[PDB]
Design an enzyme around this catalytic site. Structure first.
Site, short mmCIF file in Angstrom:
data_model
loop_
_atom_site.label_atom_id
_atom_site.label_comp_id
_atom_site.label_asym_id
_atom_site.label_seq_id
_atom_site.Cartn_x
_atom_site.Cartn_y
_atom_site.Cartn_z
N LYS C 14 14.72 -45.25 30.59
CA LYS C 14 15.89 -46.08 30.33
C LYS C 14 15.54 -47.52 30.74
O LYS C 14 14.86 -47.71 31.76
CB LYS C 14 17.10 -45.57 31.13
N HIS C 133 13.83 -33.13 18.95
CA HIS C 133 15.08 -33.58 19.52
C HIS C 133 16.19 -33.23 18.55
O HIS C 133 16.10 -33.52 17.36
CB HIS C 133 15.04 -35.09 19.73
#
Lengths: 114, 442, 157, 438
Positions: C14, C133
């Site tokens: 992040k 994903h």
């Protein structure tokens, strides 16, 4: 080019008319106030080159003295500026043809000796 | 009954805009001109609603001072233009309108590319930010230099000279712009030996080295053949003459560059043919927005100190135009329209030719960190010392700026001091016994 | 990968964008070097105005090679080849291969099953591991009363 | 406090806008939800303020208690150009799993013009397509064969020919027919190609069949699409949803390159667009297909089921260049397309002939009226019935007639010229409800 050249000459002239405004107040105060005229001569020695870096130096010390020259430099230019152009051009044109005449006479001296 | 001059039309954001300056022939009124220019570039023929496609001339004003010169603003529907194609943009805007019998002279001054159109172009293959991360050069402008002379120099030897420079502490080196593949220096050979210099000098300095290889060629096939092979050698940067080669050929090359992650230097050969005259042609400001759009990572913006004023303001303007993301319209710097770029990367302006070391502090104060300061020719000790000189002068300049000094008022000293540490820099500075004018005093 | 006798440790970086390639890459190195097996692209990171994939791939590769040599342990980062067209999706996997990357990631649901079947074959042909994903799964699999359960989509994947 | 809920932000034109409807869980404030949905879909040395997605308006859906509409603005930089896939992944990827929300549904999206300019869209679209098919001034006819397998390609081919010669414009491949053990795809193609060539020659009208290219791999899909191209086929079909957006975006560029029309079948859509409280509504998906690429798209039947108000809306959205926001028709934000071409809506399933004048008046000349099965006389007379019925309607409209209160007569009248149309109408003895008078 020429737009740049004239902008320079005017700022130089504005800086040189500042020099001449100092030279008139020093001559007019070289009699009425010799001690203070001696101080102004010492401070301004070599500070003449830039007209706007000089006024910023005199405003930082003696404010009454800086405003005077400002009125003096304003009076001179409002009087003598009108006459300037004529004197420069015909001055140069005279000087130039005179330098060419002497060059042609120097040319003929190298001519007949060859 | 002229529908091509609409004084009240407020432009849509998606419009293309263009500012022409013109001298109308005796008799022609200004509104007749601007309308004809609008008509010709757009539809121009004179049951549908054609209105969408008709390009509208929406404002006319006379140039301050200049008599018989007017600015004409024209708006163009987003639909008039093919995507990614500067070629088409040009052909649409500058294609015909320059030939009018009713016009003494026409000059294209600026174009507002709408964000909606900008988005259809790839732009620079990498652009300023990426390229710094690619080369690992930060916190200073980039130093390049040109090798003189042109031909009459073997590959082995050109290469040797390139090594001498790069090893002496310079980032970049460049092919003379008329060097492609001639009877005595076929490109394949120039490329071999230049590659060797880079690898060696790079390993020896422990610094990323590059030389702009001139892939400019006769055909798209040939142009690619070379770039392809410069890639094969692992070269980080190639150069291309976008104007003499042409915009189509360039758009092509700039994409290829992004695909192969090869930096793309752009030399504006033949620009002066178009951009010189105040009264006619296209201004380089436009061609630069175009070069941004087509593609390229560097672009020769010419120096700002050889040439005097008014280039200055205008050049500062378009340096901003190729660097930034948003540029406020400012007429005094020659920026006619506010330009956005919607996060399209910036082009590194390259300050080229006629400049020596003394110019260094000035160049840094003007162009700042994101610039390429080329130095072609000549130091009394050879290439390497010449390079070192230029390099130290630069390093000295950056730090002096970061320390907080006035590079205009202190440029002299900042160099003289640094010179007491680099004898090469000494020799160079001492080569120019500089002239100052003081008027007579006393 | 030569990893046995334990689960595998990965981690996500992040934030998403607002981070240069040089710097994303730096952060990836910091992680992998610190003793992790894997690293991953944020699932909405493909190729945006400020992080074109070719660059993300260069710098990630560099982190893997370095960290791998420094830890003496096989390192990998899931490179998000998810793309607009099959052509583009392949262009990237092809280039991740060229860099010798051991693993790529792909959003099977938003990209679609056809595009995936394609990618999964290519992977076997080039011996590249394939991370998957499930972006947008919650649109289908959340509600008890309607849709398809993830159990099915998993058998499908 | 949260910097993801900015109640004063006015959207820049270049933003991407999204309208969500959600029920928050007992306790969860609405602003927190709208902000998390904003945060998660966008981002979370902080000059990040550019890239953050902002939630700029929240309101309660009238009537429905515990229902909110959240408007989110996204910067033009968040999304890969030409990628519908990345658009979705960025918008729908994760925001749907929040434990603080009982349900989330994506209602609408305003694609800015700067982003739209980075998509091909339809490989041809309405306008162009007509110039190619030479069909003008009326909606186009098509119909679906029945059943699927159990028919040898030779027969499917014979059945197709019956329909195209009967006076139709198109026939369609049953959407779950790709390549099964008892109807391998290349055979179907051959015999369908031959059915077009025959029937087109005999009628002097351009004939088509939506060949179903949908396949397991991209490689395979292209193999089919372009062997279809080899046959000189004018149109192919694709299940954009079950296949995937990436796989489609691909096919659509190919279609523009090879000048082949694209028929998009919306298989699986009910899994996503059915429920009011959860999922993505079809209007969004429809916009994404327009964006990816496609010349036809099943907008579903109108005359069955509210459906109407909401359907007409997105029909407008896939056809027009500029669409004014109008909540009552489902149009959440104004939408420009910047000359990107429109997609022909396709009315599919459930409709027989009586519906004809309705379908004309609702949809107009730019639509495809698909008629999947059955006329008592066979395929050809069925196709003739449905053509006459249509021709009759186009002319009745052009003369100025009211297709709602006159539909009945318009068909009964032209019914006395086509015995095939007569027998079709006979099949449905209509029901009208009158209240006890006198």
């Amino acid at each position: 080019n020429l737009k740049q050249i004239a902008k320079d000459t005017a700022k130089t002239l504005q800086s040189y008319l500042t020099y001449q405004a100092l030279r008139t107040v020093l001559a007019q105060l070289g009699e009425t106030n010799p001690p203070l005229a001696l101080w102004l001569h010492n401070f301004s020695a070599g500070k003449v080159q830039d007209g706007e870096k000089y006024i910023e130096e005199l405003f930082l010390e003696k404010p009454d003295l800086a405003l005077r020259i400002m009125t003096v430099r304003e009076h001179i230019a409002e009087e003598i500026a009108e006459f300037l152009p004529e004197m420069v051009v015909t001055g140069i044109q005279q000087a130039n043809m005179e330098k060419r005449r002497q060059h042609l006479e120097r040319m003929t001296q190298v001519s007949l000796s060859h | 009954k002229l529908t091509y001059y609409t004084p009240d039309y407020t432009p849509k954001d998606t419009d293309l805009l263009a500012a022409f300056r013109f001298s109308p022939q005796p008799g022609v009124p200004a509104d007749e001109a601007g309308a004809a220019i609008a008509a010709e570039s757009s539809t121009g023929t004179w049951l549908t609603d054609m209105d969408r496609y008709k390009g509208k001339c929406y404002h006319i004003e006379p140039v301050q001072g200049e008599e018989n010169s007017y600015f004409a603003f024209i708006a163009y529907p987003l639909d008039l233009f093919e995507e990614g194609s500067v070629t088409n943009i040009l052909t649409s805007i500058v294609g015909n309108v320059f030939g009018f019998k009713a016009i003494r002279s026409l000059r294209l001054e600026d174009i507002r590319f709408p964000v909606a159109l900008v988005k259809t172009f790839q732009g620079p293959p990498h652009g300023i930010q990426v390229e710094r991360d690619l080369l690992n050069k930060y916190g200073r402008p980039m130093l390049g230099c040109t090798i003189k002379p042109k031909l009459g120099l073997s590959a082995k030897n050109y290469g040797r000279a390139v090594y001498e420079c790069l090893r002496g502490g310079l980032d970049f080196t460049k092919d003379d712009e008329n060097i492609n593949s001639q009877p005595f220096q076929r490109w394949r050979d120039r490329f071999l030996f230049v590659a060797d210099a880079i690898h060696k000098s790079q390993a020896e300095t422990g610094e990323i080295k590059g030389h702009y290889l001139n892939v400019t060629a006769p055909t798209c096939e040939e142009m690619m053949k070379r770039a392809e092979f410069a890639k094969e050698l692992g070269m980080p940067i190639i150069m291309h003459d976008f104007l003499t080669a042409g915009f189509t050929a360039n758009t092509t090359l700039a994409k290829w560059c992004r695909d192969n992650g090869v930096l793309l230097h752009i030399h504006r050969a033949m620009h002066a043919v178009i951009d010189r005259q105040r009264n006619h042609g296209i201004h380089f400001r436009v061609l630069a927005k175009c070069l941004r759009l087509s593609g390229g990572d560097h672009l020769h913006s010419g120096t700002v100190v050889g040439k005097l004023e008014g280039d200055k303001a205008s050049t500062l303007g378009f340096v901003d135009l190729m660097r930034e993301d948003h540029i406020e319209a400012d007429r005094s710097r020659g920026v006619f329209f506010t330009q956005d770029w919607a996060s399209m990367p910036g082009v590194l302006p390259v300050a080229s030719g006629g400049i020596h070391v003394w110019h260094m502090p000035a160049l840094v104060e003007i162009f700042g960190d994101d610039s390429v300061l080329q130095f072609g020719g000549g130091h009394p000790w050879g290439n390497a010392p010449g390079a070192t000189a230029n390099r130290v002068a630069l390093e000295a300049c950056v730090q002096a700026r970061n320390e907080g000094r006035d590079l205009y008022r202190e440029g002299g000293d900042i160099l003289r001091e640094a010179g007491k540490w680099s004898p090469e820099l000494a020799a160079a500075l001492d080569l120019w016994k500089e002239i100052k004018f003081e008027f007579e005093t006393m």
